[PDB]
Every structure is written in structure tokens, then in C-alpha cells.
Amino acid sequence: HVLKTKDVDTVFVERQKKVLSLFQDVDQLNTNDEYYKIGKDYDIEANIDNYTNKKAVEDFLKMYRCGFLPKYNEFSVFHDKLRDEAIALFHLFYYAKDFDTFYKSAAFARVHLNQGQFLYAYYIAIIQRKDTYGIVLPAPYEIYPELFVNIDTTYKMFRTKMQNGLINPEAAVEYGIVKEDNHYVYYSNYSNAITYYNEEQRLAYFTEDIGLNAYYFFFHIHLPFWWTAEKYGNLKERRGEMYHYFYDQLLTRYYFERLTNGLGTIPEFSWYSPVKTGHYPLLTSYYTPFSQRPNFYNVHSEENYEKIRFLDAYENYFVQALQKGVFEGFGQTIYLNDSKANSFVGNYWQDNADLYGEEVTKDYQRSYEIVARQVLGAAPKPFDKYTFMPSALDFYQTSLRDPTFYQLYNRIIGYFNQFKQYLEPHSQEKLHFVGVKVNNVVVDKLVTFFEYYDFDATNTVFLTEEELKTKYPHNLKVRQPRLNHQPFNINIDIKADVATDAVVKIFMGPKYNENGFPITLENDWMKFFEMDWFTHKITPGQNTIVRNSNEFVIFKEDSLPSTELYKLLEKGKVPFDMSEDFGYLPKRLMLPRGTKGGFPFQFVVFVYPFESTTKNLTPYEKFMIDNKPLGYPFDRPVDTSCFKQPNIFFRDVSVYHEGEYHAYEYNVPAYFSH
Amino acid sequence: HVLKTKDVDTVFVERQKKVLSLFQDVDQLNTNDEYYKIGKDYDIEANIDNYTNKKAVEDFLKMYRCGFLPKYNEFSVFHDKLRDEAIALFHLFYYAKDFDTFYKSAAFARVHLNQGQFLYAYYIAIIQRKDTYGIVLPAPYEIYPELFVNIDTTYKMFRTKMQNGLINPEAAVEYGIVKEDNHYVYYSNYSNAITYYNEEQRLAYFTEDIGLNAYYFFFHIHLPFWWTAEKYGNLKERRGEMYHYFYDQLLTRYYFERLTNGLGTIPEFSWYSPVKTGHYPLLTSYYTPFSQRPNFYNVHSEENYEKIRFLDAYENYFVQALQKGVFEGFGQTIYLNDSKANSFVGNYWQDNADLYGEEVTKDYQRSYEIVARQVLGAAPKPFDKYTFMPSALDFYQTSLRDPTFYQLYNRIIGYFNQFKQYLEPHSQEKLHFVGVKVNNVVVDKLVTFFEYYDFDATNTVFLTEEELKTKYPHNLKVRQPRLNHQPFNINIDIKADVATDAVVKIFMGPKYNENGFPITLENDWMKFFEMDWFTHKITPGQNTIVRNSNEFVIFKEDSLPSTELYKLLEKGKVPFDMSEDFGYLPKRLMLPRGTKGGFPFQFVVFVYPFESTTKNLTPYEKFMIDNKPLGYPFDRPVDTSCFKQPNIFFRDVSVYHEGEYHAYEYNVPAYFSH
Ligand SMILES: *[C@@H]1O[C@H](CO)[C@@H](O[C@@H]2O[C@H](CO)[C@@H](O[C@@H]3O[C@H](CO[C@H]4O[C@H](CO[C@H]5O[C@H](CO)[C@@H](O)[C@H](O)[C@@H]5O[C@H]5O[C@H](CO)[C@@H](O)[C@H](O)[C@@H]5O)[C@@H](O)[C@H](O[C@H]5O[C@H](CO)[C@@H](O)[C@H](O)[C@@H]5O[C@H]5O[C@H](CO)[C@@H](O)[C@H](O)[C@@H]5O)[C@@H]4O)[C@@H](O)[C@H](O[C@H]4O[C@H](CO)[C@@H](O)[C@H](O)[C@@H]4O[C@H]4O[C@H](CO)[C@@H](O)[C@H](O)[C@@H]4O[C@H]4O[C@H](CO)[C@@H](O)[C@H](O[C@H]5O[C@H](CO)[C@@H](O)[C@H](O)[C@H]5O)[C@@H]4O)[C@@H]3O)[C@H](O)[C@H]2NC(C)=O)[C@H](O)[C@H]1NC(C)=O
Ligand SMILES: *[C@@H]1O[C@H](CO)[C@@H](O[C@@H]2O[C@H](CO)[C@@H](O[C@@H]3O[C@H](CO[C@H]4O[C@H](CO[C@H]5O[C@H](CO)[C@@H](O)[C@H](O)[C@@H]5O[C@H]5O[C@H](CO)[C@@H](O)[C@H](O)[C@@H]5O)[C@@H](O)[C@H](O[C@H]5O[C@H](CO)[C@@H](O)[C@H](O)[C@@H]5O[C@H]5O[C@H](CO)[C@@H](O)[C@H](O)[C@@H]5O)[C@@H]4O)[C@@H](O)[C@H](O[C@H]4O[C@H](CO)[C@@H](O)[C@H](O)[C@@H]4O[C@H]4O[C@H](CO)[C@@H](O)[C@H](O)[C@@H]4O[C@H]4O[C@H](CO)[C@@H](O)[C@H](O[C@H]5O[C@H](CO)[C@@H](O)[C@H](O)[C@H]5O)[C@@H]4O)[C@@H]3O)[C@H](O)[C@H]2NC(C)=O)[C@H](O)[C@H]1NC(C)=O
Ligand SMILES: *[C@@H]1O[C@H](CO)[C@@H](O[C@@H]2O[C@H](CO)[C@@H](O)[C@H](O)[C@H]2NC(C)=O)[C@H](O)[C@H]1NC(C)=O
Ligand SMILES: *[C@@H]1O[C@H](CO)[C@@H](O[C@@H]2O[C@H](CO)[C@@H](O)[C@H](O)[C@H]2NC(C)=O)[C@H](O)[C@H]1NC(C)=O
């Protein structure tokens, strides 16, 4: 298995080395590095002429003169002042006229501002600036190891650094600390191996997967809720569509994990009754432990009365709109069938900038998602504007760790899917592909298994004044068994009458509901996970297509450590997926953990006429090369018909699991010591 | 102000240095230290002849061959397996025939067992073994810094050790990190300065005071609930009495702190309703954050049903016994007026070894306190016998930090005080001192203030292989402004007729109830804090006594750091209080924080005939040199009478507070950088 690579010129390579120079030992400053002197003395005001938007820069300065979040404090975009500062910072980076000005702005920021706040604006700037297009971003778990690994392993790294190596390596082995080459390897268990407070803990290997959590973080920075979608042209008009698609797919993939673990549908809750499934974040900030929500949390308390009425009202508005058939307010009147309706409900539920036709959201435009994450997070009200006790719901890089996160968005998509039933359902005629039939589909054996994976967690530790004079060590490694599956082929047999350009799509859906009974398309259309999307020319007669799972366009390869990036740059190359598909879901997680006996699911291949690509979303996600609504043909319900279309085929499939079933078994000392 | 000292011989000095050699860098093992070689190869089986009790040793070996709690895990005496192991370990220490066998056993333990478990059994053995009587114990906050200081300062020490010093001292100052001499000083705030989740936070300077918390730890190791009081001869028959006294005194003192902060009486709760006052420990173990209990915690959940029914039953039993006038069970039938009844209720509520007439409690003799701490701590059930998420209620060294601790014991003493109204109240004649009269009592100005206090927190950090080759650094200093007061005199005027040996006691009580109205002796007799106890020969005629607060026998001086202990040993001396009164409440806390305008209270002096001391508790606490019930004459209600005895005087008093009201103000960088 070789990793696909991409060629880049020298200018790119130089910029790449520059951006990465600001991603090292992030919680510490290195006066021996070039960026320090540059950032320390940089004069924004003096160079105001090197920014394309002066007002934006003057606002950053007016704001910066009043002080920003101090260093070491936790930064979160869900907190007003913190967000407003980050956005102003983003504008400073985004409006830089050229890479040079941008780099100096970033250098200035790294030196003078809070580490988290800078990293947040920096990551986004790199994604939005045209001149940095394609520049590879380091894996989020590499930059924020303290948000991707439980404290028990973070403290082990702290111990090692304080002792300056292992004092008794034979002993350290028993606690998962091993020395390989010049690296210190730490086997890190998911939380279910240390605390089992509720049945949801059985999903810890998935909900805590560093790839899965990185994926949500990337979803955010690719296009923040607080920013207009303007930059991506067409994406603006189709924003609500992308909102629905991202979440429905995420909720579905998560539901599949619940299914093979016998956990049923995503639980429903009430703002007026105790929230049943708690969560204990085994994470910590520099000032406090993350807030915990115990099982059966009494959410309806004095501290939340008003917030709960706001959330309830936000919901009533949407339910009442659906009932009277029209959305009123926000400067318009949209009937459910309006062509702008879909984006309106998505922008409404997210409370993003495009809902207001502005470029950035304001403080007073209260967000349903923000307040919900607030009361579900269970943290006491913030001490002040710069100080708060964080919860897993306060970060895009830790959200998928909390069960209520899926419960909250499932509630939101619940409303979205209700909206979908008022739309014109796909008719049988429109779904029918004349002259094209799928005679058969064969799927190789589906098998999952856990496989060790390492990532550089050196940012966890602080360096010595002497160490800062030499090259960064990239010394520590975190090792964890991560979900994976064996590659598999899907054989598609198509009998055609005439020759045409077709689009073939591949989905995975459940076979049975939570009670073990047959699925029903009328009620389960929203439970189909899109796995592949590609064009193919069909010739009259027999057509045989063979797609390997490794070719599925929806997924990406695992990120590489920043160190391996450097070696690849020496050859004028960068990892292909890491460069253009950083926001895709890791292909190793495309299949939910199976069972020893094999768990039932079903694949479905749908092929339709390839036509208009006038409003595609290629600038955002490469695989969105069509005019069809995202998720087609399962983007909305379909005109019920107990009679299948010839151009669609369902195949029963079973997902088995090899090796040890529990991930923690691979972290048992007696095992990894062989 | 000089500290009282005591002379010790050469044998004592040698034993003192030995015990202290095992209290260094406790979370780490030093192969260069003599104890490592001794301990690593000590063969208990081979020296089984060097133990006064062969059975206990064999039980230990039998248990040890099966495995003990692993190193680094949290140890708590409230968990069965952990306790039984700790107790077996204590027996191995206690039965050593001589100091030398004891020391070797200790070294063995230090090398082979869990650090927390070792320290616990070690601390107790030094207190219990006769040959170690007088040996000075190091401050608990110096041994368990991670239990006496919040993570924000712990993390600063970690960052310092990792950087191997300060990289930018000028910047460090802004985070309360300063360098003094060869020490790194860390200004540490109480939690109310970082998070204010409920009004009880206003009491953080008191509830988190290291001395107050150390005081509870000393109370416990002086005589564990799981051990018989046999060793202390007389105390055994008066154990229940001591229980009542200790908690009543502690609860009353805590009540005073509440009063000067406008927080009213200690809150009452129900096991069937949400617990109002939550608590967020800013502490952490090596594997998990301490459990948090949000405000209005839903305690009556499925996980606690059975435990709550047990707690209910436990209370029911007592209330029914009071109603029918008799305590049945436990191998006897006691009427409320029995002479052993007082000791029974105390032993019953604590579920101690003496309640059952055994030397140590068994796992199946379920405890009210343990189960109550369990449900109030709000932690999920333990992962397994060796792994649990700790709460402030799992340690005698952090218990007083949780508001529910006071609520729990206030509930208990609530029942104990109800039981006391069934007893014969003190008659006016037995309280009268014929011939003795207190004409007047004048109290000097009562003033409180905050004053910096340092302690060695180096145990927080891990030492380097090289650092272990040289002497321990005792490098880190934690600095916190701690409550204190100016010394004050109490002038007593006594007019006598005849000459007799008298006992004079000094109490402090409230002037008004929570609503600002006059106190009533009938309902507030249990609200008097004992401050002094001493004998005095009264001469006929005018008698003038002057007692300085520094002389009150109830309190002790602050502990000295281990390093100062060594210097003092060279002189063949040891702190007096630290050696003989380690269990007393630190005198700097005898007064609650006052208010700028002076908060109302009252002092009361009571003098009575000095006589019998046949059943005194001097072997336990020095100041208990009489036969009268602990807390006399406020140990039980008194035959209501409207004309006070001439040998008792009540004097109004005001407690003022000077300097900054809030402790955190003294940790503001602009302030301590002067
Ligand atoms: C415990 O607990 C407690 C309780 O909680 C705590 O306490 C706290 O603390 C804190 C901390 O410390 C605090 O805070 C702080 O404060 C401070 C002070 O303040 C003050 O002052 C200021 C200043 O002033 C000045 O200036 C101005 C302008 O701006 C003017 O106007 C004036 O006049 C003056 O002037 C003067 O001076 C100057 C100097 O400065 C000079 O120039 C001359 O001399 C002149 O003459 C000010 O500003 C203020 O003000 C304020 O306030 C007031 C009142 O009082 C008002 O009226 C006003 O308006 C203002 O504002 C306010 O208000 C508003 C509205 O209402 C609100 O919002 C609020 O309130 C505000 O505040 C005063 O007066 C200060 O300074 C600080 O600051 C800082 O931080 C912040 C945040 O927090 C920011 O924003 C800013 O910016 C800053 O930053 C900085 O720092 C930090 C640290 O901290 C860091 O992190 C950052 O990064 C930065 O850094 C920088 O700086 C520093 C210094 O500072 C240094 O060091 C550094 O350096 C380093 O690094 C670098 C890199 O980057 C390198 O290069 C080097 O090398 C190294 O070294 C840098 O440079 C703060 O704010 C508080 O307050 C407290 N609280 C209380 C209650 O008290 C404690 O802490 C604890 N403790 C423990 C241990 O834990
Ligand atoms: C993630 O997550 C996951 C999930 O959770 C986890 O996992 C986990 O893990 C853990 C840990 O690792 C584990 O545990 C462990 O295990 C192991 C194994 O086991 C097994 O084995 C054993 C042994 O065997 C042997 O022996 C015996 C006698 O005793 C016999 O009998 C047999 O036969 C064998 O034989 C052999 O022996 C030897 C070897 O060894 C030789 O001689 C020869 O070879 C011979 O042949 C056993 O015992 C066991 O048993 C058990 O099991 C079974 C079944 O399987 C059964 O049958 C039995 O009975 C038992 O069971 C049970 O019982 C009950 C139930 O009913 C209960 O009780 C329980 O369950 C039990 O178990 C098996 O088989 C082991 O080994 C370990 O141990 C340890 O630990 C403990 C606690 O934990 C204790 O107690 C003990 O004692 C021990 O300790 C140790 O270690 C530690 C650490 O770990 C520490 O801390 C301490 O201190 C100690 O130490 C020592 O040792 C070590 C080693 O071992 C070393 O290293 C050291 O050294 C050092 O130090 C010193 C000082 O001290 C110095 O001097 C030096 O230099 C240095 O080096 C020392 O020496 C444990 O137990 C588990 O299992 C798991 N789980 C699962 C589910 O899987 C993971 O971990 C995670 N990860 C992360 C990363 O986090
Ligand atoms: C008052 O609020 C209205 C409604 O939001 C604003 O009207 C909008 O103005 C923008 C230009 O900034 C137009 O693009 C929109 O089409 C307008 N919408 C509607 C419904 O009128 C108006 O600008 C605000 N008035 C002032 C003085 O700020
Ligand atoms: C049956 O119960 C009695 C009392 O409940 C047990 O006797 C006690 O035994 C312990 C020894 O562990 C002694 O320390 C106590 O003094 C005894 N008390 C009484 C009242 O007898 C007896 O051990 C139990 N039966 C068995 C077989 O253990």
C-alpha cells in the first residue's frame, strides 16, 4: 500500500516550511528561532498598507490595544469575547496582501497572543487564503495533544520529561511507556478501560478516535459557522444543503457503531427532564479539569431556566413555521417549497453569518447550538470573559467524545428531516435511468480489526532553555490501537441498451432497525451512508465495474507526522489526501466495528445520468461534482413504491471483526511486550 | 514570638532521621538511598520471629502473595480492598518487635507497595508504635501536595521542572512564579479566585486552608475508625464522647465562618431530593480528574437506590431507638440513660471497631459514613477494586473542602444532639461554684488578617536520575495568604471567699442566630467553641487572671518544613507542639475571618471546682485532664434557668478584619511584585 503523492514547486515548499515553523512546541516561545525576532518587533500600523482591508486591520488594533485573552488560558470559539478576538485576528491574517505580510502577521500573533487563540486563527487563515491553497496542515492531534489523549497518558509524558528520560525502563514498561530508537512510546487507552460509568462507554474506541475528532475540527475551520460562505461561490446558496449532509452522514455513521454494539437509536431528550447519558471528560486545562455531567443530570435548574426558554422558543418557531408552511422573519418570507428554503433551515439551525446576509456573526445574534452546548456541557457559568471551566462541547476537537453531542445534532437533523417531508419527493420517473440496469452486485468479505497507530505528541511537554537552542526533538510518540478494516472490492454488473455517461453512487445502510426488524425506506431513507461517487461511461451490452474500497472518493489516508512531511518536501512532494482532502473522513473508519459472527448491513449502488455540473461545490469538497442535492437520492424521502428501480441494487452484507474485540487488549503490557 | 522547643536524646534523633528518610520524594524510588537496598531484599518470612504477632504477619504475607494495589493508583481508606491491605500493612509495622525491624518493614513497603498506601500505614504506625512516641511527623501538605493545592499551581511546578527552570523569569512573575534564593515560589490561589459556582465558594480561604485539612487527617490517623481504641486505655470507654466533641467543635467553628460571611446555618438535605450545594474539586489523580457534583445534583438515581435505602434505614434505627428509649442490637440492650449510652451512639454513627468489640472492622459491617461519602461524592461506581474516580470525600486530607462534608456530619451531630436531650440535664446546683464568682471579663481587640505562608511542595515533581545522586532539592515553595489573627488577652476578674483548686474554661459562642436575633441557650448550647482549659489556685478575695490567646491549650503552632526539622535535630531538639500536639487545630484559625465593621460574638468564662482526673484522656489529647464530659458545661442542655450562675460570665465581643478582605488580592502580581 503506497500513499498517493502530489507535486509542488519550490515556492510552495518554501511557504510550507514557513507555516510549519510556527507549529512547533506551540505552548512555548523560542527566542532562538527566526519568527520570534520578526514577530516581536513587527509593526502592523506601520505596514497597514500591506493589507487589502484597512478597516478590518484598524479594528484588530483598536481591539488589541485593549488586551486579548492572556497566554495559557483555555481558548474556545463558543465564548463571545474569545471568538470576537479570534475573528479579528483571522481578518489580520486573511487580509494580508501577500504571503510575506501574512507570515509576519502570524509571527506577531504567535509571539504576543494566547497559544490556542493563535493556533485557531492560524489554522483557518491557512485554509482560506488563496496563496496558501493546498498547504498541508499538521494533524490536530499533533498540535493539540492535550485534547486528543486522556490525562493518564499526558501525565506519563510529564513524568518522563521531568525525570529527563526513564529512570527504570524495565518498570516503566508495565505502565505502557516504552523506548524505541530515540522515541518514548506511550500506549494510550480509550476511557472505557479506566472508567465505565454508562453503557455508552462501550463506544469509546470510536467516539475518542483521534481521526474522528480531527475530522469534526476540520469541518469547522474549513468554513466556520461565524463566517459567510461567500469565498466558496456556489457553496453560499447551497450552505444549508452542506449542513444537512455533513451532520446526517455523521449521525448515520455513528448510529452504525451503536448498532453493532447493541446500543440502538440515538437517544432523545427533553430540556425539562434529567439528561440520562452523562460524560466524564478525562481532560484538563492549565487551570481546571473539564466539567463533568453525571448520568441523569438535572438540567432544568435555576442557572438554565432562561437558556432553556430560549432553546424551547427556537424550536417552537421552527415547528410553527413548518405547520403554517412559511418561514417569516430575517428580512424575508419563504414558503417551504421556495428554492432558498433548504439553505434557510440549515442556516437557521446553525445561526451562521449567511442567515443574516453578513460576513461575520455578531454577539447579539444568539445561537441555538452555542446555548445548547452550554447547558449540555454542564459547566458552571464562566468566572469572567477570559476564564471558564471547559467541557468536551467547548471544542470542535473534542465534541464527538460527548454522547449528548450526537443527541443534540440528531435533534436538529430531526427537525431538518421533518422539513424534508414537505418538499417534493423524488418521483419514480426521475430516479429511473432508461436503458440502464444493475443486474448484480457482489461485495468481498467485510472485516474490521484494530491496528496500532502512532502520532507525534511532543507538543504536550515543555522544552529546556538548552533544548530550545537545538532542533526540536519530535521525541514523544503516542500509540493506540485504532479501528481499521481490510480492503474490499465491490463488483457491479450493469446491462445497458444505449451508451451514455453515467454517475454511479455507493451507499451502506442498515438492514434491520434497533429491534432487529426489517428497515423501511419510508422511514429510514436518512440512514444511508454515502461511500463512493464517480463517473463512468456505459457501453451498450454488458458492463462490469470493480471498485476497491481504497478508491472510494469520500475517504482519506491517515495524516503523516510533520517530520515525514519535511522529508517528502525535499522531493518536491506532499501527501495527496493531506493536501486536497484534509476534511475527508479517514478511510480506516469507513466501516463500524463488526462482530465475531458478522453484523448485518446492506450496500446499495445507484447509477444515474451524468449531466449538469453548473452549480457543483468542487471548491469546497472535491467529490461534490454534480448538480444533484447532496446525499442524492437519499437526500429526502422518495415516492413510496414497493417496486424497485432497475438502476438501483441492494446487497446484504455482513461486517465481521478479527483479532481482539476490545481495543484495550492491545494495550496490555503482557501483550505488547510479546 | 519564639516557638517552644523540646529536648530529645541521641536515640530519638537517630530514629527521627530514619523515619524522615522515608518521607522524601515519595512518588519516586531512589536506588542510591540506603532504604532501597534494605527494603528491596528484606525477607519478612525469614524474620517472622521479629514480630510480636505471628498471625498478623502471616495474614500480610498471604495477602501480599496475592497482590496489592499497584503503584501510582489512588489510594483511599474508604475502599474495602485498599483498606484491608493498608490495615494488614499497618499490622506488619505495629507488631515489629523493635524500631529496627519496623524501619526495615517500612523500607520494604516503600520499595514494593503503592506510595499512597505506604504513606497511610506509615503515618499511622509512627503514631501508634510506642518506640516512636514523640517522633515528629512531616506536614501532610508537604507529603501529599497534590491533595493540598489546586491543579493550576501544580501545573506551574510541572512546567518549571520540565523546562528545568525559568526560561523567562520576568514573564513568569505574571503567573505567580517567582524565584527567591534557590527556591521557586508559587503563589497559590484558593478556588474562589478561579471559579465561583455557588455562594459557598466565598468560604474557600477557610475550607481549603492546608492547616484545617491537615487537622482532619491528623484526627483520623491518631485513631482510625477501623481500629479499636484499646491502646488508649480509658479513651475506649469515652470514644463516643470524643467523637461528639470533635465534630461538634469542628461544625461549630465552621458555623462561625459561615456567620461572618452571611451564609447562615449548615444546610439540611434529603436523600430523596436534589442536593443543593455542588462542589468542583480542582484536584486530579495520576489517572483521572476528581469527580464533580454539580449544584442541585440528582442524588436519588438508580445507582443509589439501594444505598439510599441503607442510609435511610440507618437513620430510622436511631430515631426509633430514641422514641422507645432503648438501643437494641450489637449484642446488648442499652437504655438512653445507661452510662455507656453516650459512647454507643458515637460508635454507632461512626460504625467503628469498638461498636463490635473487635480490634478491626470487617468488610461486611457496612458504614453509614462510608456509604454517605460515596453518594455525596457523586463519583461513578469504581471501575474495579483497584480503580476509582476519587472525590474530595475519599480523603481525610480533602474532606473539609466539600460543603456536603459539613452537611453530612451536621446531620449526624444533629441526631447525637437530639439523643442528648433525653439525658439528665446539668442542674443549677452542680453548675454552681459556692464561694467563686466572676465579677468581670475584658477581652482585647479581636482582629483577623491574611498573612503569607510557605511550605515545601517539591514532592509534586519528579527528580532526574542525576538529581537522585545528590541530596534532595527541597526546591519548590507554595505560598498562600492564610487566615490569622493578632494575639489577644482575656482579663478575668474573680471574687472568691475560700481557697480552692479551680478549673477555668473559655468558650466562644455566637451572639445572634442566622436571622440576627438573640441566641437562646436552650436551643444553642451546642454552638459553643471551646478555646481554653486550665487549672488555677483561687485565693480568698480578689483574683486576677490574664490568659493570652497564644496560651490557649486547645491550639498548636504551624508545622515546620522537614528541612528546618533537621537543623533543629542538630541541636538535639524538636518543636514542642509538632511532637506532642500535632492533632490540635492550628492557633492561626481559632478566630473566623472578621468583617471591616466587626462581627458580633461572645466569649464566656466558666470556672468550676478542680477534682477527679481518674478517667482523663491525656494519652490521646494532652488538654483532656479532667473527669467532666468533653465540652463541659456545653456538652448537653442545661436545666433552663433565667438567673445565671455567678461562676460563669458572658462578654460581648467583635471580630474585625484588617488589610485586604479577600485572600486572592495578596496573590495579584501587581501587588506581590510591589
Ligand atoms: C489569584 O486570583 C486573583 C483573583 O482572580 C487574580 O487577580 C487577577 O490577576 C490578573 C492577572 O494578573 C489581573 O489582571 C491583570 O491586571 C494588570 C493590571 O491592570 C491594571 O493596569 C493596566 C495597565 O495600565 C497601564 O496601561 C494602560 C494602557 O493599557 C494605561 O491606561 C494606564 O494608565 C497604565 O499606564 C502606565 O503603565 C504602563 C505599564 O502597563 C506604562 O506604559 C506606564 O507606566 C504607564 O504610565 C490597565 O490596563 C488596567 O486597566 C483596566 O482596569 C481598570 C480598572 O482597574 C479599568 O478602569 C480599565 O478600563 C481597564 O480595563 C478593565 O475594565 C474593563 C471594563 O470594565 C474590563 O474588561 C476589565 O475589568 C478590564 O481590566 C489596570 O488598571 C494588567 O496589566 C494585566 O493585563 C494583561 O493581561 C490581560 C488579560 O488578563 C491582557 O488583556 C493584557 O494585554 C495584559 O496581557 C499581558 O500580560 C499577560 C499576563 O498576565 C500575558 O499573558 C499577555 O500575553 C500579555 O503579556 C505582555 O505583558 C506582560 C506584562 O503585563 C509581559 O510580562 C509580557 O512579556 C513577556 O512575554 C513577551 C511575549 O509576548 C516577551 O517578549 C517578554 O520578554 C516576556 O517578558 C508581555 O509583554 C491583567 O489584566 C486582575 O486584575 C486580577 N483580578 C483582581 C480582582 O485583582 C490573581 O492573578 C491570581 N493569582 C494567581 C497566582 O493565580
Ligand atoms: C489499558 O487498559 C487495559 C484494560 O484494563 C489494561 O489491562 C490490564 O492491565 C493490567 C496491568 O498490566 C493487567 O493486570 C496485570 O496482570 C499481570 C498478568 O496477570 C497474570 O499473570 C500473573 C503472574 O503469573 C505468574 O505468577 C503467579 C504467582 O503470582 C503464578 O500463579 C502463575 O502461574 C505465573 O507464574 C510465573 O510467575 C513469574 C512470572 O511473573 C515467574 O516466577 C515464572 O514465569 C512463573 O511461571 C498472575 O498472578 C495473574 O493471575 C490472575 O489472573 C488469573 C487468570 O488470568 C487468575 O487465575 C489468578 O487467580 C489471578 O486472577 C485474579 O483473581 C481475582 C479474580 O477472581 C482478582 O483479584 C484479579 O482479577 C486477579 O487478577 C495472571 O495470570 C500481573 O502480573 C500484574 O500484577 C501486578 O499488578 C497487580 C495490580 O494490578 C499487583 O497486585 C501485582 O502484585 C503486580 O504488581 C507489580 O506490577 C505493578 C505494575 O503493574 C507494580 O505497580 C507493582 O508494584 C508490582 O511491581 C513488581 O512487578 C512488576 C512486574 O509485574 C515489576 O516490573 C516491578 O519491578 C520494578 O519495581 C521494583 C520495586 O517494586 C524494582 O525493584 C524493579 O527494579 C522495577 O523494575 C516489581 O517487581 C497485573 O495484575 C490486567 O490483567 C489487564 N486487564 C485486562 C482486562 O486485560 C492495560 O494495562 C491498559 N494499558 C495502559 C497502557 O494503560
Ligand atoms: C435596519 O434593519 C433593516 C433590517 O435588517 C436593514 O435593512 C436591510 O439593509 C441591508 C443593507 O445593510 C439590505 O441589504 C437588506 O436588504 C435590508 N433588509 C430589509 C428587510 O430592509 C436596515 O439597513 C437597518 N437600518 C439601518 C439604518 O441600519
Ligand atoms: C457469631 O457472632 C458472634 C458475635 O456476633 C461472633 O463473636 C465475636 O467474635 C469476634 C472474633 O472475630 C470477637 O472479637 C468478639 O468479641 C465476639 N463477640 C461476641 C458477641 O461473641 C462469632 O465469631 C460469630 N461466629 C463465628 C463462627 O465467627
Curated annotation (Swiss-Prot), chains A, B:
For this chain, the Swiss-Prot or TrEMBL PTM comment says: Glycosylation at Asn-337 is required for proper folding.
Q: Which residues are glycosylated?
A: 50, 189, 337
Q: Which Pfam families match?
A: Hemocyanin_C, Hemocyanin_M, Hemocyanin_N
* UniProt keyword Zinc, yes or no: no
Which GO cellular component term is one of those annotated? Answer: extracellular region
What Gene3D superfamilies does this protein map onto?
Di-copper center containing domain from catechol oxidase, Hemocyanin, C-terminal domain, Hemocyanin, N-terminal domain
Cross-referenced SUPFAM superfamilies: Di-copper centre-containing domain (SSF48056), E set domains (SSF81296), Hemocyanin, N-terminal domain (SSF48050)
Q: Which GO terms describe its molecular function?
A: nutrient reservoir activity
Top-level taxonomic group: Eukaryota
The UniProt keyword set, sorted, is: Disulfide bond, Glycoprotein, Secreted, Signal, Storage protein
UniProt subcellular location: Secreted, Extracellular space
**Subunit structure, per the record?**
Homohexamer of two stacked trimers; disulfide-linked.
Q: Say what the protein does.
A: Arylphorin is a larval storage protein (LSP) which may serve as a storage protein used primarily as a source of aromatic amino acids for protein synthesis during metamorphosis. It is a constituent of the sclerotizing system of the cuticle, and serves as a carrier for ecdysteroid hormone.
As for family, the record states:
Belongs to the hemocyanin family.
Q: What is this protein called?
A: Arylphorin
Give the organism the record lists: Antheraea pernyi
